[PDB]
């Protein structure tokens, strides 16, 4: 498909998907002293990709917010004359569309390398999310198990001798 599959800020459909809200919350519960210089490099690349992405998301959502605000006013296009109502409805609706976008997980190679890496950095990140962010880890564990990832930190772990630390949502065995 694309000619830039090597890019770290890129991803395919079956990569680990984290919304921007989840990514920032995950960042809020980590320490740089506990990560190797490679893990810090992964996090810095993710930081630059994500700063550009969070800058751009409202631009992505602007056409949909514009259309919805137009449809709320009516079936009359008063360009340059309905700007006041259009942009009040925009300042209301564009936050809602951006809410839907920012709560939408998006796949990334850096997301799938930070979480699913088998070295000590991956285990540290997984356990830190498991303990400090139980809900984020609930969703993320469901996603990882669905993607044929087998880690001890997953709630859906049939080989464990210890009971899960959260509610195990129904899934196909």
């Amino acid at each position: 498909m694309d000619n830039n599959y090597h890019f770290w800020g890129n991803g395919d459909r079956q990569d680990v998907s984290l919304s921007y809200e989840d990514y920032y919350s995950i960042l809020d519960c980590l320490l740089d002293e506990k990560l190797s210089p490679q893990g810090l490099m992964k996090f810095k690349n993710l930081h630059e990709v994500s700063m550009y992405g969070v800058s751009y998301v409202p631009l992505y959502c602007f056409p949909v917010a514009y259309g919805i605000s137009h449809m709320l006013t009516g079936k009359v296009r008063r360009g340059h004359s309905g700007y006041r109502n259009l942009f009040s409805l925009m300042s209301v609706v564009l936050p809602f569309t951006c809410w839907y976008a920012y709560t939408t997980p998006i796949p990334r190679r850096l997301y799938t390398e930070i979480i699913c890496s088998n070295n000590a950095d991956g285990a540290y990140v997984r356990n830190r999310i498991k303990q400090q962010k139980p809900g984020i880890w609930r969703k993320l564990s469901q996603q990882l198990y669905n993607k044929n990832f087998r880690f001890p930190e997953l709630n859906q772990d049939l080989t464990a001798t210890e009971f899960p630390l959260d509610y195990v949502a129904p899934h196909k065995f």
Binding site: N3, N4, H6, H80
Partner: protein, 157 residues
Amino acid sequence: GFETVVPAPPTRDDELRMIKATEEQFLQQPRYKLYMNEAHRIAKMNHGDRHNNIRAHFWSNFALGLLITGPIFIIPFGKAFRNLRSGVPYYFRPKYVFTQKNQYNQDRNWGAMKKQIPLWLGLSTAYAYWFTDFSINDDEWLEKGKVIYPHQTIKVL
């Protein structure tokens, strides 16, 4: 992360060979490439070369994109300005200036161009960014910023 054997400080012959290599590598810089003398210069120059390579490809694709976005997208998009949603043919709706659209399809053609040229350029830019390859300059771990010295590039005697 092991270490290599540190050779003894060079003798006068080795120093002269190093000076010869550095001056020979200095002679190779094109006069139209304005990179100052510094440790990273050669590295920068290498980077620049790769960047320029990418640039060329990009522009080619950009031009190609324009061609491929000519008849496939923008012209069929301009097929939508013939009639309005009510079925009545296109007519001029003036914003502030009541321009006289005396020529044949001045209003329709101008509106179509206003909504087509930005679309043409945007689709061409999307094509260029989608199909060109930045792999040669991409460095995920930033390992290519290491300082290369001119005497290490050239072997003398």
